[PDB]
Write a protein that binds this ligand. Structure first.
Ligand SMILES: [Mg+2]
Ligand SMILES: [Mg+2]
Ligand SMILES: [Mg+2]
Lengths: 199, 51, 56, 236, 109
RNA sequence: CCGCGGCGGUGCGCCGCGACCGGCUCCGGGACGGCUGGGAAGGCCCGGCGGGGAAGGUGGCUCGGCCGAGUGUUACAGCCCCCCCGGCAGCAGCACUCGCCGAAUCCCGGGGCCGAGGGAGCGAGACCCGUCGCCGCGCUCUCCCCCCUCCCGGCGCGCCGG
RNA sequence: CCCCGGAGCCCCGCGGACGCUACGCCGCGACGAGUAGGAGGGCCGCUGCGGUGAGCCUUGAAGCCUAGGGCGCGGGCCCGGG
RNA sequence: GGAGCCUCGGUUGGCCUCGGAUAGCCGGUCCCCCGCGGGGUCCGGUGCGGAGUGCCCUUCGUCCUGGGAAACGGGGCGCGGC
């Protein structure tokens, strides 16, 4: 009943657009590995664009004024917040469904997570165009926890590589098992390829 | 009076113009006739293909 | 010109307009041509005695 | 009392003409050269002294109401339900299979037997298999699956009709007021004729269904929409 | 013994940008996204089904807390397989982004 | 009191169906006209007449196992293409959807939606009612016959007589 | 080739609505922004007078109040309870 | 274990490599190196991806008895240790 979307390889606003409408239709969404979101346009371009946003502050009392979140998760949240009617009750309710993470923490680090191919960089950009990793961007504008988020993700990838190896090992045995058994599953296996699987 | 649309309501068309009946009796028959004759061409073409 | 679209109607157009939306002016009351008794009553002094005559 | 000498071409258009019909009907040769006060209308009876008495059948009334509604306007083409024409989805043919969508027998699978007079379907998901007796349903609340048993030569009872498959109980007065009267009665009892009808019909079907492998097991099962499967995508 | 209704979300009312026309719901039927995939669903019965404090009656059942507003999918709304509905009362707005059940049962199948 | 007979208005509350008409929006079929009396195409092939790319060719070189692959040159036709003369039915605005405009040269069937809005009977021994216009028909008061066969009747599921 | 105190009626000229407060009732079409301004209608509203309701009222008037029931497009109004 | 106000949404699950994109996925190594795995080469398969989210898993009536194929699997909110 819940989207989990690996924000890696996606485009910041392009993903946010799609997430907003999901969120407005009552879909609970989770967006994970937000540092891996990447924004079209060469790096420097986007840094300035952020740095400008930093300059925007309520002169008389900055403490009130537009809160510039550094973490890539909160950045991505900010851009999704910009596509909902978030002053309404229904808008605020909508955001409460969305759940964003720098990196990929423990509920979702053992969940299969989708990819919006309509927000994906490999598709939506020309290959000769330039872009920025929202991590780097976040890092240079003051995000504290890049390295921590990297050191925790190397653990995760090592932990996962193990799971995949065991998964592969079952798949392989299952391929062997069928071959071991294929005269006493033969007139089942035949019927599952008259109606068109197994081919 | 309610305006029944002649072009949908056969009998209203006939009320306003009775020659419609015939015009539409023709052009059912005419079209059937020709539809039959197309099948007959198609059967002869299949027979010519078989030969 | 820039207030109208116009041109040369088909036969079918004259039929479809007259049958689907044919309304007489009969004592200055827009009245739908439900029967030829209406057309005749008004235009029968010209030899026009039915919807068909009108169309012609 | 001959039938219709011109056939139908289209609803409202006969095949022939006026002129062909004159010749067919032969209007030539079928030419028909043809150039109260005292007496009381409709009363009359008997009786003893004085003489006989003149009654009056349908005697003028003993109360008029103060105001009453005034007629209608004839209205042309407004038949009562009985005189209606009955449709049927081409999908639903005899000995086809349905998925009954609405009632208590909901999602249950079934065999279609006939369209009754009403326009309702008669149905049986052979009581034995499914727990669905001889039963009426509507076309409109039923999905005509593309799965048929060959039911051609089974003699469904003539006596089973709309009129029989029709609810029964409850009359007007009785004790009425208190804490009684037809809140009880309680149960629709099945009756024996009903059980006999079922027994007869099912036996003719039941062998026929079985001939098709797994079909009984299919007819045991219940239909329901799971995840990822959308009515509009799948076929039945 | 399972689900005999296709899922759908109440998108919101038929509306222009700045005039919402509350008497017509819009319905995002799950799994259908083309003014093409949606001739199945035209004229199907549909239920906004919700529960409330006080008890109610229930057809062929004992008194319940669930209530429904019945309606009917009328026509297809714009290319991407949204659908228009119309309900025997207008839908609450409380209802936005919640389930309404599109049945199968005025079937033409 | 039982008839829910005939007519009239009604439904306590929530429901559903059905068919008829109006107005819509779609879907599926078919049948026609016109054109540069469409353009291209296909299919059968035959006889010629040239021109071009560029070839089962040849040749320099290169790359692989005389053969295969890659460039390069003069260019006939043993890969094709193009023009020109002359001639076949298979065409048909072609489900081989390559490019139109249409319909007295046009019809049929089907689905979704919204709506029904009016009320030409207030007689005392004889209707509490039809219906006007249009469609035809259908029927009959005219005879024939043929078929199928539903009810009923007869004879041996079959045959014979509403 | 006859009479409606009886043709039986889709038209009836012998008598005529359920309808006809003729300032009534009914039918067909069309149309409907509005300041200043103009005109019409208000069985809208206030107070007093002539008439009139064999009106109402201590078995409860006027006023007052009311998450009660309704009517009217509306000015307003009528009922219930206090 | 029993009742009993209230607030609601729901109406099978999916228990995961990393990543690439002018490339990838799986095998198996005969052979070599590193800590049953990891890395390499070589070879054999897939590649509009069927070791496919266009996917997979799961079944959705209850029971009875009396055969076959499949057969030691499931349970007791079974119980203790790692
Ligand atoms: Mg005005
Ligand atoms: Mg003014
Ligand atoms: Mg529930």
């Amino acid at each position: 009943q819940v989207l989990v979307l690996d924000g890696r390889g996606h485009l910041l606003g392009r993903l946010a657009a799609i997430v907003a409408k999901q969120v407005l239709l009552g879909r609970k969404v989770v967006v994970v590995r937000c540092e891996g979101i990447n924004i079209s346009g060469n790096f420097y371009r986007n840094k300035l664009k952020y740095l400008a946003f930093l300059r925007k502050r309520m002169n008389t009392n900055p403490s009130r004024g537009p809160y510039h979140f550094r973490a890539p998760s909160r950045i991505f949240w900010r851009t999704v917040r910009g596509m909902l009617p978030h002053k309404t009750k229904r808008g605020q309710a909508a955001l409460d469904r969305l759940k964003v993470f720098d990196g990929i923490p423990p509920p979702y680090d053992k969940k299969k997570r989708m990819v919006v191919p309509a927000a994906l960089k490999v598709v939506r950009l020309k290959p000769t165009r330039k872009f920025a990793y929202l991590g780097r961007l976040a890092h240079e504008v003051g995000w504290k926890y890049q390295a921590v988020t990297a050191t925790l993700e190397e653990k995760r990838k090592e932990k996962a590589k193990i799971h995949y190896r065991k998964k592969k090992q079952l798949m392989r045995l299952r391929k062997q098992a069928e071959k071991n058994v294929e005269k006493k599953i033969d007139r089942f296996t035949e019927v599952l390829k008259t109606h068109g699987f197994l081919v | 009076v309610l305006k029944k649309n002649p072009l949908k309501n056969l009998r209203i068309m006939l009320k306003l113009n009775p020659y419609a009946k015939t015009m539409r009796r023709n052009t059912i028959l005419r079209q059937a006739r020709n539809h039959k004759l197309r099948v007959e061409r198609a059967a002869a073409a299949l027979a010519a293909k078989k030969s | 010109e820039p207030y109208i679209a116009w041109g040369y109607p088909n036969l079918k157009s004259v039929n479809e307009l007259i049958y689907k939306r044919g309304y007489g002016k009969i004592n200055k009351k827009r009245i739908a041509l439900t029967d030829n008794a209406l057309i005749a009553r008004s235009l029968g002094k010209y030899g026009i005695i039915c919807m068909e005559d009108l169309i012609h | 009392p001959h039938c219709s000498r011109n056939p139908v071409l289209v609803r409202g258009i006969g095949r022939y003409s006026r002129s062909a019909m004159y010749s067919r009907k032969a209007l030539y040769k079928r030419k028909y050269a043809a150039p109260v006060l005292a007496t009381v209308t409709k009363p009359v009876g008997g009786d003893k002294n004085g003489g006989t008495r003149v009654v009056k059948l349908r005697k003028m009334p003993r109360y008029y109401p103060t105001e009453d509604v005034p007629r209608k306007l004839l209205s042309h083409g407004r038949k009562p339900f009985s005189q209606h024409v009955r449709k049927l989805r081409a999908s639903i043919t005899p000995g086809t299979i349905l998925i009954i969508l609405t009632g208590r027998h909901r999602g249950k699978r079934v065999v279609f037997l006939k369209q009754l007079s009403s326009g309702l379907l008669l149905v049986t998901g052979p009581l034995s298999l499914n727990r669905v007796p001889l039963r009426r349903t509507h076309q409109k609340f039923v999905i005509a699956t593309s799965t048929k048993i060959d039911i051609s030569g089974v003699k469904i009872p003539k006596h089973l009709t709309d009129a029989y498959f029709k609810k029964k109980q409850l009359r007007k007065p009785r004790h009425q007021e208190g804490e009684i009267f037809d809140t009880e009665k309680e149960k629709y009892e099945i009756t024996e004729q009903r059980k006999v009808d079922q027994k007869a019909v099912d036996s003719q079907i039941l062998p026929k269904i079985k001939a098709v492998p797994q079909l009984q097991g299919y007819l045991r099962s219940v239909f329901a929409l799971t995840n990822g499967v959308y009515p509009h995508k799948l076929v039945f | 013994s399972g689900r005999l209704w296709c899922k759908a979300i109440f998108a919101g009312y038929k509306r222009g940008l700045r005039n919402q026309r509350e008497h017509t719901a819009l319905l995002k039927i799950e799994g259908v996204y083309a003014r093409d995939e949606t001739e199945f669903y035209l004229g199907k019965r549909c239920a906004y089904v919700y529960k409330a404090k006080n008890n109610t009656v229930t057809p062929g059942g004992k008194p319940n807390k669930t209530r429904v507003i019945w309606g009917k999918v009328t026509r297809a709304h714009g290319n991407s397989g949204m659908v228009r509905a119309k309900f025997r009362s207008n839908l609450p707005a409380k209802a936005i982004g919640h389930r309404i059940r599109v049945m199968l049962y005025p079937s033409r199948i």
